[PDB]
């Protein structure tokens, strides 16, 4: 197991010409060990496939994933855990590529296995909540849409903490979600609640001494990654809605935590 | 985490009733609330949903427009007004930080005769 962690660290720095012989490597041991059919290998298959997708090797990321889906589905059975996990990194695979349609069975499949074994109340319901919702949203069905953005958000919140990752990128995607609607307002009301979970984490409760960036750049115009594209989005609302003055201190904010709309999906891995 | 329910009680079809949440416990002010619902011989249903500082709200399709979602974050509260009140409404309330009712309370019964 200790192989399988190991990838996933060096993965996370961009080091492609180390992680991507280490896995083939790794399966190179395991087909000889315990041959091709075996729950290891479905592993090492998976993150290999999210590896080649983070460097726009799709196809080569579909072809490990439907085979690892093929060992799982196996050497573990068709409603386990591990086969939704594969199911959902096929979803959003076709997500990724704006096939939507042929992306929403296999995300049904594998909320269908989550929420039967693992209970309607675990985290791995709200990420295949957060998946569908947003798989939904890029077709222009909104019907339940926003219920299983507010579902995934509670169980987030409770499960793990308020100031989760999952929460933030859960939240930015309802806020998208907001603003392909129209419903310019209720985007602004939720990226400003990201913008100040993120202020009084790090500077303290909201007082007149103490005021989120938001605030600021309201009192102007009147004389995490996911933070960034919070600080853009919101900044863009305030452009649209000519208060400049507002928009540039975002713009500002955005530029020193560093280093139309800002389009981009927050999907939730395995 | 701490969620104490009350204002239940017995009002005739067509009456209001307003449910308290005493939060305790946790940072109140930094969780999205949810009030859900248990009638007698059914399964739990979710009925409101309300964001941290009360700018968006939700409600359960047959409950829109009768009932009203909000919060006193300082006072560490959550609040129902239940207006129009139907027999299909009838039910032990809860409040809680998931729709599941996960840290629900004892609820509160809310009862619509005659």
């Known amino acids: 197991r200790t192989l399988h962690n190991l990838v996933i660290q060096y993965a996370s720095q961009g080091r492609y010409e180390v992680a991507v012989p280490l896995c083939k490597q790794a399966l190179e041991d395991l087909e000889k060990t315990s041959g091709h059919d075996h729950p290891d290998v479905a592993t090492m298959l998976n993150i290999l496939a999210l590896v080649y997708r983070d460097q726009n090797k799709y196809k080569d990321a579909a072809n490990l994933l439907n085979d690892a889906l093929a060992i799982r589905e196996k050497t573990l059975g068709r409603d386990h855990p591990a086969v939704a996990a594969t199911l959902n990194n096929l979803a959003v695979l076709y997500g990724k590529r704006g096939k939507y349609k042929e992306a929403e069975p296999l995300c049904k499949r594998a909320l269908e296995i989550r929420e039967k074994v693992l209970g309607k109340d675990h985290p791995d319901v709200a990420k295949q909540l957060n998946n569908l919702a947003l798989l939904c949203q890029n077709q222009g069905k909104y019907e339940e849409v926003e219920y299983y953005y507010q579902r995934a958000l509670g169980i987030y919140q409770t499960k793990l903490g308020p100031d989760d990752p999952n929460v933030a990128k859960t939240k930015n995607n309802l806020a998208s979600c907001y603003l392909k609607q129209g419903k310019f307002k209720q985007a602004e009301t939720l990226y400003k609640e990201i913008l100040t979970r993120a202020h009084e984490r790090e500077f303290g409760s909201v007082d007149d001494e103490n005021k989120p960036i938001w605030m600021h750049a309201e009192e102007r115009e009147e004389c995490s990654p996911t933070v960034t594209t919070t600080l853009k989005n919101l900044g863009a609302l305030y452009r649209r809605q000519g208060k400049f003055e507002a928009a540039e201190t975002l713009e500002e904010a955005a530029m020193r935590s560093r280093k139309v709309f800002t389009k981009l999906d927050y999907y939730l891995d395995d | 985490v701490q969620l104490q329910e009350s204002g239940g009680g017995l009002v005739q079809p067509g009456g209001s009733l307003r449910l308290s949440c005493a939060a305790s416990?946790?940072?109140?002010?930094?969780?999205?609330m949810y009030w859900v619902r248990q009638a007698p011989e059914k399964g739990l249903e979710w009925v409101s949903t309300?964001?941290?500082?009360?700018?968006?709200?939700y409600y359960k399709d047959s409950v829109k427009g009768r009932f009203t979602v909000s919060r006193d974050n300082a006072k560490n509260t959550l609040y129902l007004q239940m207006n129009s009140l139907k027999p299909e409404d009838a039910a032990q309330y809860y409040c809680?930080?998931?729709?599941?009712?996960?840290?629900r309370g004892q609820g509160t019964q809310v009862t619509v005769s005659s």
């Open positions: 809680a930080t998931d729709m599941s009712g996960t840290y």
């Open positions: 309300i964001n941290t500082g009360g700018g968006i709200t």
């Open positions: 416990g946790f940072a109140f002010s930094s969780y999205w």
